[PDB]
């Protein structure tokens, strides 16, 4: 009974809308533009993970360091607690040691 | 619920089809039907 009795509404995807059509453009901005701009500068998103990657603990540490002062009170409390828990987990628990 | 199982009906049926000829709840309930079917095989 966890299965729907009717076909879901047809899903139409426009493979040639502007976003899909122009996806990937300027990814070679650096090599093809005298390296004036690094491709990582094309990444639009959270300030603390623009052209940067890491595990959950590293991401939380970076978030607190970069925007922690501008975070809401309860969100910052949650971030501090998550950092604490992730520290304990990564530094004290696991199969390999 | 990013990823959910949508085939569970067919996964249950693949076992119950071999238990339809059993007696009692072993021919209806998967928890029992699977055990009985494994024993039968």
């Amino acid at each position: 009974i966890g299965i729907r009795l009717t076909l879901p509404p047809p899903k139409v995807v426009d493979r040639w809308n502007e976003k899909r059509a122009m996806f990937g453009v300027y990814d070679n901005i650096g090599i093809l533009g005298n390296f004036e701009k690094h491709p990582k500068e094309l990444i639009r998103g959270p300030i603390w993970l623009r052209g940067w990657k890491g595990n959950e603990l590293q991401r939380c540490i970076r978030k607190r360091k970069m925007v922690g002062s501008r975070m809401f009170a309860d969100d910052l409390h949650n971030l501090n607690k998550r950092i604490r828990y992730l520290y304990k987990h990564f530094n004290r628990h696991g199969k390999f040691r | 619920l990013r990823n959910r199982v949508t085939d569970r009906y067919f996964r249950i049926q693949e076992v119950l089809k071999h238990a339809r000829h059993f007696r009692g709840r072993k021919n209806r309930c998967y928890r029992l039907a699977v055990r009985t079917v494994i024993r039968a095989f």
Binding site: G2, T6, L7, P8 | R4, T6, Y9, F10
Partner: peptide, 26 residues
């Protein structure tokens, strides 16, 4: 509702099979 189409399609085919068995065509 669970997102997906292939399980629903399989169930529709099985429902068609059951309907045919219950009401065989002339």
């Amino acid at each position: 509702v669970k997102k997906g189409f292939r399980a629903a399609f399989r169930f529709q085919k099985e429902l068609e099979r059951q309907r045919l068995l219950r009401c065989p065509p002339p």
